Design a protein around this ligand. Sequence first.
Ligand code: JJ8
Ligand code: JJ8
Lengths: 459, 452, 453, 461
Amino acid sequence: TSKLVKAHRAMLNSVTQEDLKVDRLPGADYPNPSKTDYIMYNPRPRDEPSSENPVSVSPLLCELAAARSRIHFNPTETTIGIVTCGGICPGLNDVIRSITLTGINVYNVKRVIGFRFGYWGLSKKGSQTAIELHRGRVTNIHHYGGTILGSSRGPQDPKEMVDTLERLGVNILFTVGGDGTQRGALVISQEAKRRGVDISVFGVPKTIDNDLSFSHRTFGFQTAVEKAVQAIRAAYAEAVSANYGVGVVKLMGRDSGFIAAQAAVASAQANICLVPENPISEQEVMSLLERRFCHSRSCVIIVAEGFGQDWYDASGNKKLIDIGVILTEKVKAFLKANKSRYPDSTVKYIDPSYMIRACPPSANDALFCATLATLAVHEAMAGATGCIIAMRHNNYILVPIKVATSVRRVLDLRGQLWRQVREITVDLGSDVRLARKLEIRRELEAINRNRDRLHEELA
Amino acid sequence: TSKLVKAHRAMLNSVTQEDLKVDRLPGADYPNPSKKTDYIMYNPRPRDEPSSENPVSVSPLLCELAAARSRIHFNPTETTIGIVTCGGICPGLNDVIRSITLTGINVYNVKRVIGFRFGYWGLSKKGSQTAIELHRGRVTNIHHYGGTILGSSRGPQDPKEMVDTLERLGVNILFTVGGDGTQRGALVISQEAKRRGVDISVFGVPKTIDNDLSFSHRTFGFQTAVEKAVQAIRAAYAEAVSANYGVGVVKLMGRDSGFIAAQAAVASAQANICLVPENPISEQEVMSLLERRFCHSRSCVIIVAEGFGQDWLIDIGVILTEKVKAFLKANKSRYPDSTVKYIDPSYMIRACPPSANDALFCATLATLAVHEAMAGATGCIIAMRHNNYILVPIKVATSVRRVLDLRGQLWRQVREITVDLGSDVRLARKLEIRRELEAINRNRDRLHEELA
Amino acid sequence: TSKLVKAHRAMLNSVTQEDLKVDRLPGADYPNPSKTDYIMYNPRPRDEPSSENPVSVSPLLCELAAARSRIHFNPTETTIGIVTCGGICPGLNDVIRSITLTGINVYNVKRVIGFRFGYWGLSKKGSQTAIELHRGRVTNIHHYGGTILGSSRGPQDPKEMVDTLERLGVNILFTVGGDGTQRGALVISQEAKRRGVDISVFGVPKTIDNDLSFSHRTFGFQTAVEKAVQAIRAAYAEAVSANYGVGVVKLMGRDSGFIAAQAAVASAQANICLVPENPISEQEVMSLLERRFCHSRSCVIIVAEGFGQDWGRLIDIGVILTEKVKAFLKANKSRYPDSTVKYIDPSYMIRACPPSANDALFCATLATLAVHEAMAGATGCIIAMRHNNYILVPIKVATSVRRVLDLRGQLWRQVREITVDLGSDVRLARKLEIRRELEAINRNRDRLHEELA
Amino acid sequence: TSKLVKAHRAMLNSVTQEDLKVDRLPGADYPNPSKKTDYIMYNPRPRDEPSSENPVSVSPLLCELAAARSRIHFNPTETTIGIVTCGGICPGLNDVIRSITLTGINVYNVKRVIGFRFGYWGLSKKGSQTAIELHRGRVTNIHHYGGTILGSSRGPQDPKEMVDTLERLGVNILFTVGGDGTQRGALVISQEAKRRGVDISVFGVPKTIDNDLSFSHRTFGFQTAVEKAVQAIRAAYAEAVSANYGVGVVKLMGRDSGFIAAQAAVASAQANICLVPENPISEQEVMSLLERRFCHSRSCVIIVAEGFGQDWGYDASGNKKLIDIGVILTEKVKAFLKANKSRYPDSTVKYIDPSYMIRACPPSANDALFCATLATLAVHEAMAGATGCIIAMRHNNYILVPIKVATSVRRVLDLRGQLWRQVREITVDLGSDVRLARKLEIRRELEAINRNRDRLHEELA
Ligand SMILES: Clc1ccc(Cn2ccnc2)cc1Cl
Ligand SMILES: Clc1ccc(Cn2ccnc2)cc1Cl
């Protein structure tokens, strides 16, 4: 294929144009109380600019998401279900709210059910806990972080859940969660189709890491970066205030390190940036720290939680070793070994994970959540199922779950972002004597200029 | 015929593929002390249905991708870079200054970087005296602050005077950070310096908060502007809600667009009326929407773009404010006690550092602008389209401008939350209290149950 | 009488110890389901530290506010009323919430009524709009600015309002507003006592200007400063970006200029600071601006809304001062050729916002104590903060005097410290400046030379 | 001892009026280049009721007010000022550095200002080499940032070495920005420099975020710390609420006090349990409060001061040697919930150490102004020959406290005071019942809602 990595429980070994076909629940009878279009996967041309229009490098076309002239489900007779799974994430309530109010205010659906604490709230034993989502209940939930429905990790019995959906007359079930959640949602889809029950299962991709394939952005990412940067600023001030001071700060990234990268660059306070895409040895790290301490009394280390997972697997995804705490103790033991050279020295660990997830979204992420939701509803009412909504090239597209779980995104280590990271982070490939000379040369040239202009300012 | 408007002094009456060719200063001798031009389609939509072979763009237009080049035209250790910030301020102006400075110094190792004070006036013979050296030490933490250390000013100077100053200071590359007018001036400087046969690259960094730049989905400062706008709406709302028949008027940015007005209205979800230039309506149309709102609520919030109602360049905020006040003082009968609050948050929106996302965006826009100017790009701007960075000829970028698609999903989402006269108020208000009552009865039932 | 100013319709010409006696509704029968103490007005000693303990300069003693062993009203039989009057203010909802929940959760009162849009919500035609304040209704109101009850300026008929209080069985009415509100609340108090009706009227002082007498702090002030400072930072960046750029920024202060002062000092970006306490001429201002433009291309002017109220034909001193400066710079185009003047009214972003956590805690405490005291039969009085202690002040007193910047005080020192001084010869000052600048840069030069091998 | 606690190595067993006398360096020759000491009572509470004569303080103690003096002791244009920041960082450290610098330069026009790097180590022979010049240009915008440009370090140095460096650099005034350890060191330097008869003024700027300083209602950084704590609680709460039987443990500052824990708990109003050193309780007492909370809610938030429960797991450099009560309490709760899986089946426990986001940040504008004032006054008084003393804030006034006194006593939550009331008001009380008492509460909202229902039915018509 091209840019993407094969996921660990991939259902596809490649993606053909057929794989991108979005399952449509049979029928399209009722008019929207309010033809499918495509966009190219790759907008790069195959040839150089000749006489005729340009041609995509990739044969892949993606289905654009938008409110349909004809809808499949009958508005005033439909019941919408929502369930939030996994760890929390900025704007979870924003998705809940926009789904609720699009169903109520735009399609005028019969009712909206919010299932409590993830898939457990569709189990026979926790279907008792579900709640009614009227306007009054979601009025200001978007002003807050986490989820009013609550969440939980891991799966339930597909049969139990489809049982609860039928019993509550749920025509559309919106699965707000990560890879594992949407793979579960495909199981529910194939169970409800095994029974021939008219239910649409539709995924709203919840990943803060923004490692979603056929996606440039997922909701919560931008807010996560903003927060990460504020955590780095505190790590930096804590580290700078100490002689041979190290600040370790763990940012999100199991599979990607997009947060680690973008936050490192944006703060411009990152001296070392450890991401899963670029795995390096313990001694490689300590060597970068050693280099840094040649010329500065201060080092700041960004580490993605998915880095150095050799210094497993829960329910869907993978059990991480706490690389933050490991890396912290490794550095401490390295500095206690070279007390000779780095006499007084201090190492500070920061897990800002809680302040990053558990907060309302930036207005830009809030608007993005609102749009992702409203469109997901517009399409589920038009019989879309077994699919997610994502953002590519300024457009909203529908991706089959089977595809979206098969491939994942990952830093291009030859790309402009990672350039800008190496631009600011320690490079062993710089002679520190020669570099530091040419530095003070410029500093001196500049200060002598000011000296000259100040002499001039005497009457 | 697509989603662009032809600009007021457009230099092109159409755009052909030739018009998109980016001027390259002759020669490409020196190697990038760091380390074929590539394209992306204008329109990524296919002409046909998904058939056997790969899909084909609806539009014949191809855009030049911006990236660090294997071969550069200018000699690093012999080059001098010039920067000038023009017009009104904007979030992350200092971020662009800093990243240009430090990319030139730290990545290309240029001889020196000159910052011209207060816009084009700082290249005039009479203000070239005020220009400053941009060493690392001078730009260290400027990105943490709003406005511009160089300072800015509106309007033009003598092209000859400015090229004179560029030659005298040995400026090989001049980075013009400003709006439409600035970049049109920058093309004048380009054509003057080429009339003299002087090896200077003039390169534009588009400064518009309104995000109305053609061949662009995003301009630096926009996201931060939205974030701030939303915080101003939240204060307008709390001020209006606290009053019986309370109106909050809040003026957001938008001379030509109303992208801020729209996105902020939707994101806050506190906008009852949203006035933008793209949708001009009468005074009575406004007062009718306010009247409708006051049928069911004691509270109205009005978003107005500074470029709206320019037939009532005129302070529509203060006009609209007095119009509403005079309308409510007429109709005291119906709206007895009533209060109207004007808010100009313009100052808190422009004059502030960027959000981390806009900071990263500024940094990238800059670093790439340098990577391309060193590779002999001139008479062009850098913009963001479809997740990619592209080089657009100034002649093109000034010929068309962006504008809200009133049939597009964003404006849908605005009408979704703002007063609609086209809704029967009796029928709507009924179906409202029906749901309210259903919900109340549910809670009632569960509370009755709570006898353990 | 010394450091305070006499208010414009003061009910007292001085304050005696008797004037400070806080009206107690007769009876104290029921136990708190949960002796009055004093603090000195002035804690300064009359004499030196001699053999015996020190003695206050002032004879005045203030009643400390705290939960009483015995309360006057019967908890499960009491109804509490709240009304927010005037302009909004950070933490209005915080006061509403803490009063509500102290009455409910601590005293377990029968019910709590919130009267809509200020005194209008106690008028016969408006009492229909009042609302029930259960826990569920005030749960998260403190996260927001302005008032869920809503507010309105001006008075109503005292008789109409006492009529509504009796009809709704309101035993305690909490008046959240400024001077005018509490003077109205005393009228209601004296009307309800003219009828012999067992109602306690208790004031929670709402002033952002913090010009309340017998008070060092009022709720909303700290938050106001924080916001003011953020407005100055934008004014500054707007002004700096222009050649001969002026930023005018109007902060709160009708009678005081405490916000103007504290914000000027805290930002340290204020070049001129105009406050009502120090009224100066138009030409005095333009002279300070002129001085500033001798050495800098940038001036930032803090103006209190109550300054220069004699410049007009409150008058909008922000807009006046703005046009005056513009006309002065257009007159001296010769000297200040290109020049720009930017006005900023951040008034809306300052009032209409939730409180800083420190102001939220302060609101919570002001409220909870106001309830603890009203249940113990306190009436015709306000609660304020003096010298780290909470005290009860008779409204008659609190409306008679107001606070005001001490222009010889350390704060105003720190303002003059950073704002243009005409009393500096600019030639001699600017010399001694570049001397230090050069000394400093030569030092760095020396240390950089050292860093080479 | 009456309201205050005796500190662990207190230099006084009581405070008399003589103990409050602020050491004045002999002489007061030069005029303040800027154009008789006043007192305030310790306790402003009267002994008797309001009778015929003026009221009399309960306490005989009078405190010296701090303010710019008509006559100063040191010669401005001939004086050198020294600054050193010690210990852990704190909001507005740079604000104190800046205001001291610029008051000395701009107001007194002192000869020079030296900033000693990384605490007392920067006065040691071996680190005196690292000290820096503090000109206007160097402190211009440092106040916009957290931590210290000078840098800091814990622990002591040789008093002789440090006085050696002070004499060699001609430092007339040394400003010690640190905690009570730092100021006790500063008294050692004071008594060493007086043993040599060297005209040096040692003046303390109290750096405690915990706000446990005696003869002080406020220390710089406190308000900002609260603000930040509250934002950490809000994230702890949202993380806990999103889980079925979800616990959020959040460690706030408080080695000796728990003022942050208390004020943050009350202000957030999201705290279900609040553990502070002043009120030590058993492991089972905690788990019992959690158990109670889980009877009625699926969500618990626990505020723990770092100085609480220091007997669940002596004394190295400073006061003690703290066990990580955050991590202990976290594992204890986890093991308790894993034991009662029966009752609390699915359950989640989240630990949060927001310590770094609280210290390492610039001050709130209110704390910035407070830092600026503390500094400018400290300079105004050191120039007027004040030494062996700190500046603090009491009853809206700035006072000078002898270090010997300030290190002898410390503040601590009054557990019968209105603040701690307001904490118990919102935190789990075992003295509400299972059902028979714990019942009367679930009323109100239902009674209210039928009224609104009725009026909404009416709005047909
Ligand atoms: Cl919501 C979601 C998130 C990520 C992915 C692909 N992926 C990324 C990392 N591991 C799998 C797929 C989906 Cl459906
Ligand atoms: Cl910097 C810039 C800003 C806006 C536009 C398009 N335009 C023209 C007039 N209004 C918007 C073009 C450019 Cl090049």
